Structures are given as C-alpha cells and as structure tokens.
Amino acid sequence: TINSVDTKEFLNHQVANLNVFTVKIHQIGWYMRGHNFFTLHEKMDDLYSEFGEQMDEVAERLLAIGGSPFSTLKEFLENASVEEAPYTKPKTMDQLMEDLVGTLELLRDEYKQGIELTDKEGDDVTNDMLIAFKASIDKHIWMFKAFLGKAPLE
Amino acid sequence: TINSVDTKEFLNHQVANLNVFTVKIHQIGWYMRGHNFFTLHEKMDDLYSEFGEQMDEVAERLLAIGGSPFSTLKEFLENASVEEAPYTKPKTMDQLMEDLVGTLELLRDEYKQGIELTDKEGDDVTNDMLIAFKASIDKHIWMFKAFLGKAPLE
Amino acid sequence: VDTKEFLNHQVANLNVFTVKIHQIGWYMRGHNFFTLHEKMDDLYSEFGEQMDEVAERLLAIGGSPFSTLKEFLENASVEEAPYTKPKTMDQLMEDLVGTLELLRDEYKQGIELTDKEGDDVTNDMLIAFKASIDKHIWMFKAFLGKAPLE
Amino acid sequence: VDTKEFLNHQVANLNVFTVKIHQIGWYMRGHNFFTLHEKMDDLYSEFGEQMDEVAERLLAIGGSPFSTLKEFLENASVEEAPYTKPKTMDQLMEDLVGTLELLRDEYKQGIELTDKEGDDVTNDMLIAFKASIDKHIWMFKAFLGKAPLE
Amino acid sequence: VDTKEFLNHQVANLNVFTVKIHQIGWYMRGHNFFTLHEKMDDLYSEFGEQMDEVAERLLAIGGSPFSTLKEFLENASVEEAPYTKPKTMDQLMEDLVGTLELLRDEYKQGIELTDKEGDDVTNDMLIAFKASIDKHIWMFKAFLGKAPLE
Amino acid sequence: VDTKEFLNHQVANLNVFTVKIHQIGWYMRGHNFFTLHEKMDDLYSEFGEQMDEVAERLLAIGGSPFSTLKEFLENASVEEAPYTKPKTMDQLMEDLVGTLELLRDEYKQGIELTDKEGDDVTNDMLIAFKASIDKHIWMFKAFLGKAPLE
Amino acid sequence: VDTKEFLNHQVANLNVFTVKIHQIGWYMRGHNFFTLHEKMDDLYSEFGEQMDEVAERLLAIGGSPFSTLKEFLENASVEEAPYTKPKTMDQLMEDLVGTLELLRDEYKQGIELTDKEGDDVTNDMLIAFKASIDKHIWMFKAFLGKAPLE
Amino acid sequence: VDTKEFLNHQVANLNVFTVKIHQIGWYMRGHNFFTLHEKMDDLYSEFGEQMDEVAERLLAIGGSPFSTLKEFLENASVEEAPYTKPKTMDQLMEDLVGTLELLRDEYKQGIELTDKEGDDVTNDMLIAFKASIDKHIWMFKAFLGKAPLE
Amino acid sequence: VDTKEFLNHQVANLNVFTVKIHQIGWYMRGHNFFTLHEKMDDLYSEFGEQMDEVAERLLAIGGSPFSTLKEFLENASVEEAPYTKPKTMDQLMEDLVGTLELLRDEYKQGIELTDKEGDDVTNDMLIAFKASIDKHIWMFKAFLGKAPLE
Amino acid sequence: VDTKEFLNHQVANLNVFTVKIHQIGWYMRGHNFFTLHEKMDDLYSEFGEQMDEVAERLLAIGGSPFSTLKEFLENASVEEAPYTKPKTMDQLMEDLVGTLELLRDEYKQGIELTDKEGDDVTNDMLIAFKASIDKHIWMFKAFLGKAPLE
Amino acid sequence: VDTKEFLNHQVANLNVFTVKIHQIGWYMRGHNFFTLHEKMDDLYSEFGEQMDEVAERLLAIGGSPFSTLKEFLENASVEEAPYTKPKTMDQLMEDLVGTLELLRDEYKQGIELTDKEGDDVTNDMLIAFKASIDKHIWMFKAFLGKAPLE
Amino acid sequence: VDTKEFLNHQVANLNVFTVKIHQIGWYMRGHNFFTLHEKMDDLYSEFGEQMDEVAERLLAIGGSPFSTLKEFLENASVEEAPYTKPKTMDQLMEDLVGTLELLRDEYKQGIELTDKEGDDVTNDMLIAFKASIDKHIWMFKAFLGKAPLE
C-alpha cells in the first residue's frame, strides 16, 4: 500500500528526527556512568550542538524552499522515525553508545534517501547540505563503532 | 484538593519547560515576518542558546542532587506548564513577541516559586542558580516589553 | 553559453550587484536604517567575495575574466539605475530581493550547464553560492512581510 | 575662550551627553528598541572615551579639567531634562541628533580657535571627533527619514 | 526606602563616584602615578558598569532611574568637591577608600532591605558588587599601609 | 568557629587538596591516564583559584590567612598520605571524591555559619564553590559507576 | 569643483582603481606572482575602504555619491583598459604606480580645496589617505628599481 | 578500481606528494626562496590534511588505508626522485605543477567513479580537493609565466 | 656517523614514525578510541614538526636531507609493518612506546656525538626533543599501567 | 645526592616557595602594593609551573616525587615562617630575593650534578629555570636599590 | 632646514632617544623599578616605531635617511652620556622628560616648517607624534610631582 | 675577554646590526622589495630582542651594558657604512649574510668562553641565538643561490 515524500516533507521529517536525536544525546550524556564518562560526556555535548546546528540548518533550508517546519514537540513526536524511551533501568556505556550508533545509522540511511530524492527533484542546495551532514555522520559512525570495538559497517 | 513539589520535582519540571520554550523560540525565529525580522531573528537565536544552556544547567544540577532528569520529548510534553501550539495562521511580530513575553513571565513566576522552595529546603546552590536565571529573564522581560511599547510589569 | 561565458557573465553581474548594495546602504532612510545599513555592508563583502571566487575560478579553467567597469556594464543582466527620487526602505529591499532572485535563477542555469559540461568544481561553487542567496531571499522576503517564493 | 576653556567646556558637555545617552537607552520603547538600545551603549562608550581624551589633552596643555557633576552642570551648553512624560523613539532620537549637532558646531568653533592658537594636537583631536559626530548625524538623521543637514 | 528607591539612590551615587574616580585619575601626582592612574581607569569602567546594571535592574522591577546630573546631585549621599588645593596620592586614595566604604555600607543596607522585600535578584546583584568593593577596600587600604577595616 | 576561622580552615584544606590533586595526577596509571591526568591539572588550577579567593576574602574581612605549609598541616581536616603502595585509578578517584565530599559538607557548614553571621559575600562565594564541587562529585561518581550521593 | 564634487569624483576614481587592482591581481604572471597577487588583494581592500569612507563622508556633508558603474565611468579621471595583450609584471606595476600618482596628485588638489573651504574633517581624511598612497608609491617604485618621485 | 581502491591510491599519492613538497621547500634556492619556501610549508599542511581526510573517509566506508611507507611507494602513481643535481626554482615548480596536474586528473577519475557508485560524500570530498588543486595550478602556472592549462 | 649523518638518519626515522602514528590513530579500536585517536593526531603534528626542524637544521649545517620515501625506508632504524591482524589498544601503544624509546636512545647518541663535535645548536635541539619524548614515555607507559623505564 | 634526589628536593623547595610568594602577596602593604601584589601572582604561577615540570621530569627519569605537605616540609632547604609581626615591603622583597638566591645557587649545584650524570634534559631544564631566576634577582635587587649580586 | 633635513634630523634624534630609553630601563633602581622598567620598554617600542615612520616618510618624499650610528651621532640634538655615577629614578625621569620636551619643541618647529612647505602628510604625522609626546610629558611630570609645563 | 666583556661587545654589535638591517630595508630596490623589506622588519625586531636580552643578561651577571651610540661605535666589530652609491638587492643581502656570519662566529667564541667560565645560562642564551642565526644564514644564502657555508 503506498505513500510519497518530497524535499519539503523529507526536510520536515528530519527537523522532527533531529529534535528527538538531540534530546537522546542529552539523555546519554546525563545518564552515562563508567570509566569513559569524561570523554564521552564531552563528546555528547559536542554532538548535541552539532546535531542542533544540523536541525536549525534543515529547518531554515525548509523555510528557504517555501516550506513550513514542525516547531512543537507534539509535531516532532508525531513525525519522527527516530525512537526515544525514558531512562529507567541502568544502561552500560556500550548500550548507550549502541543506541547512539543505531540512531546515527538511521539518520545516515534516511539522509541517503534524502540525497537521492533531492537529486531527482533537482534541489542541488538541499542535496549538498544533506551530503555534508552525511559526511559528518559517517565519521561519527566510524569513531563510535571503533569505541565499541567494531568496524564502521559491522 | 492537594499536591507537593520538592527541589528535584521543580528542577525536572523546568527541564520540561525549557525544552518546550527553546522549541517555541525557534518557531518564533523561523516564522517571524516584518520590518524587525533581522534583529529579532538574531535575538531568537541568542535566546535559543541561552535557554538551552539554562536547561542543561537545570538538568545537570538535578543530576548533582541525585535526581533523574526527563530526557524524552514525551516526558517534556507530559510535564511542561509552558504551552505550545503549531504555527498555522499568520502571526504579527507583536503577537509572536507577546507569546515570547508570556512564556518569559510564566518562567519568571515559576522560578520565583522555585527560589522560595529551594530556600525552604536549604538547597543554596539550586537557589542561587535559579536567582541568576531569573535575573536574565527579568532583563529580557524589560527589553521585550519595551519592544512592545509597554512597561516591564504592564 | 559555456561555463567560461557563464562565469564571466556573473563577474559582470556581481560587480553591478555590489555597487547596487552600496547604493542601497548609502541612500536608505527610515527606522530600519542601522540594522539594514550593516546588512548591506555584510552583503557587499559577501558578494564581493563571490565575485572574486567566480573570477578566480574562471582563471583556473583557462578563462579571461572581465576586469573593467565598461566590460561589466556591457555584459551584466543585473540592472542599475542612479539614485534620483527618494525610495522607501521596502522599495530598496524589493530591488535587492529582485536582484537576489535574478542571481539565484541565473546560478541555477549555471548549475545545470556546469553539470552538463562535467565541471564538478564550478558546479559545487555555484551551489554553495545559491545556498547563501536562498537564505538571503527568505530573510529579506520575511523583512518585506512575504513568503520566500511569493 | 581659549583652548583650555574650550576643552574644559567640552568635558562638561560630554558628561551631560553621556548621561543623556543613557537616559535615551534606558527609557526608549518601540519596535527599534534592540538596535537603538545597543546603539546607545556604543555611543555612551564612544563619547565617554572622547570626554576622557578631552580632559587628558587639557591636562597635557597645563589645564585643570572640571571633575565634579556641579562643575559639569554649571558649565555645559548641552541641556538635560528629567524623563517624565513618555517620548517616542523619534523624539528621543531628535534629542540625540540635536545634541550631536550642538557638539559638532561647538567642535567646529574649537577647531577654528585651536588652529588660530597653533595647538595642532588639540586641533587634530577635535577634527577626528567631529568626523565621528558627522557620521552619527548622517546615520541618525537617516533613521529619522531625513537628510544629514535637513 | 524600598528596593526601587535604594537602587535609584545608587544610580545617583555611582555617577558621582565615577566622576570622582576620574578626578583622582586626572589630578594625581607622585611616584605611583602610572599604576594608580591605570587603576582609576579600571575602577571607572567597573563602577560605570555597576551603575548601568543597577539602573537596568531598576528598570526590570518597574522603576524609573534618575537620568540627569541634576537628579544625581540632588539624590547622592556620595560627596564631591572640585579639585582646588593639591592633594597627596594618599589623600586621594583616602577619599577613594572613604567612598568605597560608604558604598559598601549602603549596599549592606540594600542587601538587608532587598532580602526583607524578597527581591532575590537585586539581593544577589548587590552582594556581587559588595564582593568587589570589599576586595578594593582591602587593596587600597593596603596601599595606604592599613588593615582593610582599620 | 566564626567566618574568619572557617575561611582560614579552608585555606589549609585547599592547600592540602591541591597537593593531593597533584599526587593523583602524578602517580595515576591505567587506561584513563590521559583524560584523568588532564582533569587533575584542571582541578589543581580551579581549587588553587578557590584557595586564593578564600584567603583574599579572609583578608577583606580583616582576617589573617595561614601562609605556611606548617600552618596548613596543623589546621587541615583534609587528610594526606605519601604515595607508597600502587593504587588503582578507581582508588585514586575514590580518594578525590571523598575529599570533594569532605569539602562540600564543610562548605555547607560554612554557608550556614556565614548566613547566621550575615556575611552575604562570603556566603555567595562558598555557594558558588559548592556548585562546582557538586558538579565534580556527580561526574567523578559517574566515572566510578556510582550515583552522585551513593 | 567644491568638496562635494571632489569627493564624488574620488568615489568614481576609487571604483575604477579597485577594479584595476583586481585586473592586475588576476592577470599577473611571473616570479613575483605570489607576493604581488597578495599585495593586490590588500590594495583592493584598502582602496575599497577609502572609497566607502569618501562616499560616506560625502553623505555626511549633504552630498549624493555616484552609486552606479555608469556614473563611475562617466566621472572618473582614472583610466581603464581591458586586458588583451600580455603585460609584464613591471608593466602592470607601472600602471598601478601611475594610478597611485594620479590619486596622490588629485588628493593634493582635494587637500588644498578642502582647506580653502574650511572642511577640516574631509581635509584630515584626504591627508591620511595620501599618507598611505605615498608609502605605496615608495614601495612599488622600489619594486620597479626606481626612486619614489623618479 | 572501486571507491575504496581509488581512496587508498590517493593515501599513497598524497604521502609521496607531501614528501616531495618538503624536498622542494628544503632544496630550493634563488630570489623567490622566502615566498616559495613558505608556500611549500602551506601546501605540505594542506595536502597532509587531504591525505588524512582521504584515509579517514576510506575508514568510514569500511576500507583499510595503506599505513606504511612501503605500501605508499608500492601503490603511488605520484613519482619521486632523490635530490642530486641542482634544480632551478622553475624546474622545482614544474615538478610541483606536474604532480598537482596528475592529482587533479586522477581526482577527476575518482569524482566520476564515485558518482557512478553513488558515494555522494566521497564525491563531494574529492570535488572540494580538486577545487583547491585547480586554484594552485592557476597560481603556480602563473609563477611560471604560463596559462593554467598551457 | 657525524652530526649530518645522524640528523639525516632522524629525518628518515621521523618520517617512518609519523606514518606509524597515523596507522595507530586510524586502526585503533576500543574504549580509549576518542582520547587516543586525538593523542595520535597531536603526536603526528609534533613529530612532523621535529622532522622538519631536524631536516632544516641539517640544511643549516651544510647537509642534504633525505627527501623521498625510498630514502627514508633505506635509512630508518624505526620499523614499520602493514596493519593486517587486529591489534589491541595496548599492543598499538606498546608499538608507539617502543618507537619512542628507540628515538629517545638514538637522540641520546646524537646528543653525545653533537657535544663531541661542538655543534651546540644541534645539541640543544636534540635535548629539547628528548625532553618531550621522555614526557611521552612516562605518560604512555602510565596508560599501559607501567613505570616510565619498566 | 643524585639527579632524582636533587629534583625531589626542588619539588619540596618550590612548594614552600610558592606558599611564601602567596604570604608576601597577601600580607604586603605600602605604596608598591598594586605592582608587587600582581608580581607575586605572576611569580606564584611561574614557580608553580617550574615545580610541576621538576616533578614531571622526575617521573620521566623513573623517580617518585614528594606529593604531600609533610614531605615538602621535611625535605625543603627553603625556609618558611608564619606572618606575625608587620614587615616592610623591602623586608618582604629581601625574603623573596634571599629565596631566589637560594634556588639559583642550588640549581647551579643541580646543573653541575646533572652535567656529571649526563642527564642533558634535566640539565637544560634547570638552566632555563636559572635564567628566569637570574632575571628576577636583577629586577627585585633593583627594586631594593641594589646591584643584582650585591 | 627643509622637511627632508628636519625628518633626517629626527631619525638621528629618535635613535639616540631609543638608546637612552634602554639606558634608563637597564640602569634604573628603586621602588618604582617594575612599573617604570616596563614603561621604558613601551617607550622604546613606541619611539622606535616613530623613528621608522619618520625614516619611511623621508623615503616617500625622495629623501635619504641617515642609517648608521656615526650619522645619528653627528646629526642628533638629543644628547647622550654613558651611565657612570648612580642616578636616582627621579634623575633618570628628568633626563627622559627633558628629551621628551626637546623632541616636542623640535616637532613643533617641524610642524610649522612642514605647514609652510605644504607637506600635509608629514605635518599630520608630526602632529600625531607630538600628541603622544604631550601625553607622556603630562604623565612623567606627574610622576615627578610636577605640572606638565612646570 | 670574559663573559661580561663578550656580552657587552654583542650589545655594541647588535645595535650596529639593527641599524644596518634598517639601512637595507629602507634603501633596497628591485623585484624582491616586498618580501625582503618585510623580512628586514622581522630581523630588526628579532635582533633588537636579542640585543635587549644580551644587555639584560649582562645586568643579571653584575655587568654594565654599553648604552650610548658612542659606546656601540667604539666597541663593535660589526661594520657600518653610509648608503651612498646604489646597491643591488644581492649586494645588500651579501652585507646582511656577512654580518650574520660575523655574529654566528663571534657567538661561537662566546659559547666556548661561557662554557669555560661555567656560565650555563649565558651559554644556552647564545646557543638559542646562534640557532636562529644559522637558520637565517641558510635562508639568505639560498636567496643568493648559494649553499649555507659556501
């Protein structure tokens, strides 16, 4: 059974995703415990600011193409494919990083869909914007997978 | 009929509030139109970062007092007294600023409750943290009310 | 028009635009003077930077950039008019947005052309420039109480 | 009045002016609040800096600067009034402009006087201050929808 | 006196004080000229910053700050005198310390008043200012070969 | 103990703590060496800054800070031991957190005492210090796989 | 010619000159490319800054600056030619030097005129610009193996 | 060759190139020593940065970068020769340009390959690097008195 | 071996070492990835800087530095191996430490030799490099849970 | 005494000295308070940095630095006394100078010992510290109206 | 004497002065050593910059600056004497002030001469230098407990 | 000659050298003017700093530095000549190089002497200076198309 997504709808979906992600980054940064706390907490603060910057750029690009960004938590929750769960039972640093990596992978793959879609639509600016963001996501995937003792695509 | 709030619960409520507020600041910054766009959009970007900083400080103070911050959009929405609405019908710059001022006023008054509560509980650090934040909120109230051609407490 | 001719055309355009940005910044009056004068100074620097990068990219692909005011005037599609009768801030901003739109649409032609010719570098350069132009269109349209594409 | 007396007069003037700048920055209301409030803080700093330079030039030429509010009040030609009735942004800016023009014209008298007395340093100092005042007059007049000398 | 009246009184006080700091910095002579003139410039900035913060805090609580030299003179408890007879560096520093002590003690009154009124922000603001004043008192008393509270 | 005696006690404590921070930074071994050695250097600077501010605040209230190692040892409640037998990173961090906790609880006594005595400045100073200590306790406890207050 | 007309003429000149500086910077070849290309970029910014200052000074004196390429071409004494046949670095530098000398000499006329009219600010502005031009003439003549006035 | 093999080839190439840049910077003699030695240092940093970015991109796509000098020599198309007989600045720059051209052309192959594979990130990375290479080609050809593609 | 030969040997060594540093930084996995990867980037830069300084000192003493990968490989005592089988973080750090120790000991031979030859500059240069190596050995040995000379 | 024991002795000395520098900085009174208090703060940081470098050098040579106040007191040749009776600025500076001379002379012993043992790094480290000490001796002796070695 | 001869004379003077500033900074002793030694370093930089600017202005006007110590000695009106008998800080400052006054007065002659010759740039240059000299005279006279022109 | 006499001789030398550097920077003409003029300004600052460090080291060892041009002329081995007949850039660089070699060789004598006398600080100071001189010799000889020791 079917459905269609344009550049505007793709961008708006990422506004929702990024907002869930950035809140998740904070969850990880706040609740983490273990020997790697100092470096990883700092790392979460860096990702929080970077993905918040991506979010704002996505929303403002959406604005520039005549779109209307989701701008409430209700709308972000109703639209995001990025999943969130309250922090209840204690999680290992590895478990937290696996959740982080899984979401980075989700965003990478969705951005790839976005890159293809925007190429088809001839939206070169949005296309290049998404490529630049994927570049950074790919680097983070390599690094965080390495933290987990894994290959980037393993 | 009754209910009680301690420092932990007050802080957690503000984590929820600040997250709704910061998203609202972005809504205002994104959707604003009119002669004051450049200065006010920039101003929204500044408030976004400032209130995001307050939020993180509130959550990390909560952590430091043995609390568990809300860390999902679901939890922020379920707990916030700060109200949000999707941007549907066009709003004037004044209307957007009135929504901003109203939320600043809400936070100021809640922070005052928080200041009194934390004073009673003997949590001096949280008390001073909240005072410093109220100081900034009061300054913003004066300025934004002045933008609206109004006295700070009018 | 090839990539070389497109680039050279933008060297001409950007030089007219940059002079127009100064006109607007110099002659503007009204309540938004301080913020918009500063914004004109920013745009002047940015579009002057675009111009030099266009001209130097042209050089790098074996071209010969226009390098006189006579050549810029003879070749530009961006229009200029002396400042005679007083214009409102909105009228000045409408001239600015109109020129931004002209540049955006011409750059889109340049993006297509350079993609056809397989000039990847010029392509990416023009895309980055268009990105900034699009942001400016949204903001300046917003100043005018309008949607970016209205 | 000689150079010493002229400078001392400006010490008095600038102290009234900086206090007026603050009044305008504190009491202003309206849509241009953010940019104009910030602009008042910039002017406050600039004119405070001119003031200190004037007083220190006066010291360097063997003078004795006024250094009390009583002395500033007794000597200044720049006028001040308490903020009672609400003033529009335009009214506050007209008050600012009027004071800028007063200072410009007095500085011109100072420039002439100092040239006649052969005090080349004080002369150049006054010229550089006038330069800034003239720029401010253009910009603030432009904010008011007026020509600089209108 | 309430918080608003206390704040407004300090706006008056700080404006007299900053002018005094300048008097001291301008007229000082002796072996400690270089370091103490620089120190006067630092204090001038600091106390002018406190003044602006007091006035803006007053604004934020629904007050109306004094904004003319006439109002500052009419209301200040900080005393000023024109520089007539030459003063020793020590005498200038004694005048400075005496004023710092006056402000510290009045701020202490303000801290207690604002605590009673439940104006937590103004309270903290005044405490932070007192902190700095206390440090200055120690240092300048030490320059005078005295204990801070001697 | 009064405010003066409490402050002087912290001058002693902070001097022992700062030397302990160096011990930990110097003797630490294990996988977290680079991040934790750097963190010890940061804490050394921060607690050295706290110490000087405590001592200078004491000076400002008419006190006489301890200013010899003999006096610090004679007065500190913070304990020190020479580094003899190898300690794990966790053991070093437990000593650090224990000392942070000691300081937090003592500062809380200081906060109460200084509130009783009406020394508002010292009160706020100690609160700001406690704020930082609390943040450090959370972080270092988190490193140890523990809740801040467990 | 009055001050306004002199200033407006320089707006035109500087716009032609800045475009010429880019011509030289873009088309230059030879062993001194890196140093001289960079030098052209610096001169471009500097003369662009003089131009804006001249135009804004003109505005401040009640003038109306030329603000189109058509106006600059129709009014400039500074000459331009398209780059057709290859020029030596020396030839490009001789064109640069010649234009600097033209501007120096015209500015000298402007200095004298502005002195006659009693426009002290414009006078000082033009002198400061001449100072820079004279320094560039010395250096670029030295590059050419010549004395500054040879 | 796939993206992984192309990237790995460039890791080899860039490591030979950076070493060559150093050779040129170390052994150069003549009148353009100062500017060109500095330029070699800039290129060394830039190309070492490209190398690291290529290797890290390779890592990010599941590759395994060459990470020994043996591997770089075994795989590079960029040629190296020990400095024996003295070379002119021009000859050193010709070797530099020739290598820049080799890299540009291979990057062009990489841009097309990665476009076909749908590796958008690697594609953009290579385009950005080519952009810089093209600018260098123009500039160094200009130093050699040549057109960029001559 | 003389000073020239010793230096040239270190040019070879440092080039193998920097490439090894990158290998370690690229291929590392485990919990210490973030801090150690960053540490590898720092060491890469530092040892690259030592390398350039060694080569340039060699130039300054009339020497001819190795300036090809072939020459570095043929001359280095620092060993390299391709990354094939997965290595633990400890194993990678042991490889790093071993190379640091090799360099330290060779530098010591260099320090002795250069002292005997009376090359005071090269002597001091080597001493300063050893200082840094010794600090690194302590820190990396500490990471490995070992004493510096264990 | 060997290098390790010499270094460890200096760890002790520098810790006593740094505390003494604070004693002087805190208790000083007189006309030179501002300059000298600041100077004490600079010396505090500098000697604290020497101390950490000595301790870390000790670590790098397989040593175990003293890392408790008890150890510093039991091993230091630098003497300390509590501040009881008021001291003149000169008296405080004489205590400072005497301790600098003590450290200079001991460092000279350390330089000779370290030269004998062939510990080139520690040698150079101690020489660089002596250089600074000798500069401070000249300056502080000059403050006291004395020749450096008088 | 013309502008060229006047300028060349100041090249001579400033070179003697700068060397004198160093004499004063090197040989000074007494309580004000730290502040005044630093002040001498500041003056040395400033007057060295004036010197270079004078010499380069001379170059720009077709002159030939003195560029040997022999020429500076043969031409300077500024007097120098070897430091033999110990001088008081006041004596050293009196020599400084005397030379500052000499320079001020000669610059005043230069200002008049250059105005007569219509050398506007040199005129403004000398005025800016005098400005600073006058400020230094006020400050150093104040140090000596004297009025600037006393 | 002892350390004190050697140092004082270099105070003399560096002052002649610095004046020579300015001569070269002022009078130079030719294609390399921009790069080399800037290089002269860099050398002037560097050798002026060496000079001050030499003089202050002399002070620290109980010496009395030459502090007049008469003393520098009477004592310097570095030769100076007025600029009369035009010199080639190469001729000027040959004079620079020759003086750098003179200084290097005398510093080498100073290094030996100071090692004999056991003045470790002066020794290291001179070595650091030689380090830079050697680097300059390599670079300037390379400019002249020569090997460093040729």
From Swiss-Prot, chains A, B:
Signal peptide annotation: none
Source organism (scientific name): Listeria innocua serovar 6a (strain ATCC BAA-680 / CLIP 11262)
A cellular component annotation (GO) from this entry: cytoplasm
Record localization: Cytoplasm
Gene: dps
Entry's family note: Belongs to the Dps family.
Example GO BP: intracellular iron ion homeostasis
Subunit text: Homododecamer. The 12 subunits form a hollow sphere into which the mineral iron core of up to 500 Fe(3+) can be deposited.
Residues involved in Fe cation 1 binding: 29, 56, 60
Stored InterPro entries: DPS_DNA-bd, DPS_DNA-bd_CS, Ferritin-like, Ferritin-like_SF, Ferritin_DPS_dom
Name the UniProt record assigns to this protein: DNA protection during starvation protein
Broad class of enzyme this protein falls into: oxidoreductase
UniProt comment concerning the protein's domains: 12 di-nuclear ferroxidase centers are located at the interfaces between subunits related by 2-fold symmetry axes.
Domain of life: Bacteria
Induction line: By iron limitation and stationary growth phase.
Biological role: Protects DNA from oxidative damage by sequestering intracellular Fe(2+) ion and storing it in the form of Fe(3+) oxyhydroxide mineral. One hydrogen peroxide oxidizes two Fe(2+) ions, which prevents hydroxyl radical production by the Fenton reaction. Does not bind DNA.
Enzyme Commission (EC) number: 1.16.-.-
One MF annotation (Gene Ontology) recorded for this entry: oxidoreductase activity, acting on metal ions
Catalytic reaction annotation: 2 Fe(2+) + H2O2 + 2 H(+) = 2 Fe(3+) + 2 H2O
Residues bound to Fe cation 2: 60
Swiss-Prot record, chains C, D, E, F, G, H, I, J, K, L:
Catalytic EC class: oxidoreductase
Organism, scientific name: Listeria innocua serovar 6a (strain ATCC BAA-680 / CLIP 11262)
Catalytic activity: 2 Fe(2+) + H2O2 + 2 H(+) = 2 Fe(3+) + 2 H2O
Comment block on domains: 12 di-nuclear ferroxidase centers are located at the interfaces between subunits related by 2-fold symmetry axes.
Upregulation: By iron limitation and stationary growth phase.
Quaternary data: Homododecamer. The 12 subunits form a hollow sphere into which the mineral iron core of up to 500 Fe(3+) can be deposited.
Cell compartment(s), UniProt: Cytoplasm
Superkingdom: Bacteria
Coiled coil: none
GO molecular function ontology, one term from the record: oxidoreductase activity, acting on metal ions
Function of the protein: Protects DNA from oxidative damage by sequestering intracellular Fe(2+) ion and storing it in the form of Fe(3+) oxyhydroxide mineral. One hydrogen peroxide oxidizes two Fe(2+) ions, which prevents hydroxyl radical production by the Fenton reaction. Does not bind DNA.
UniProt family annotation: Belongs to the Dps family.
Name assigned to this protein: DNA protection during starvation protein
UniProt keyword list: Cytoplasm, Iron, Iron storage, Metal-binding, Oxidoreductase
Any one of the GO BP annotations: intracellular iron ion homeostasis
EC number: 1.16.-.-
SUPFAM superfamilies with a match to the protein in the record: Ferritin-like
Gene3D superfamilies (UniProt xref): 1.20.1260.10
UniProt binding sites for Fe cation 1: 25, 52, 56
Disulfide bonds: none
Any Gene Ontology CC annotation: cytoplasm
Transcription is among the record's keywords: no
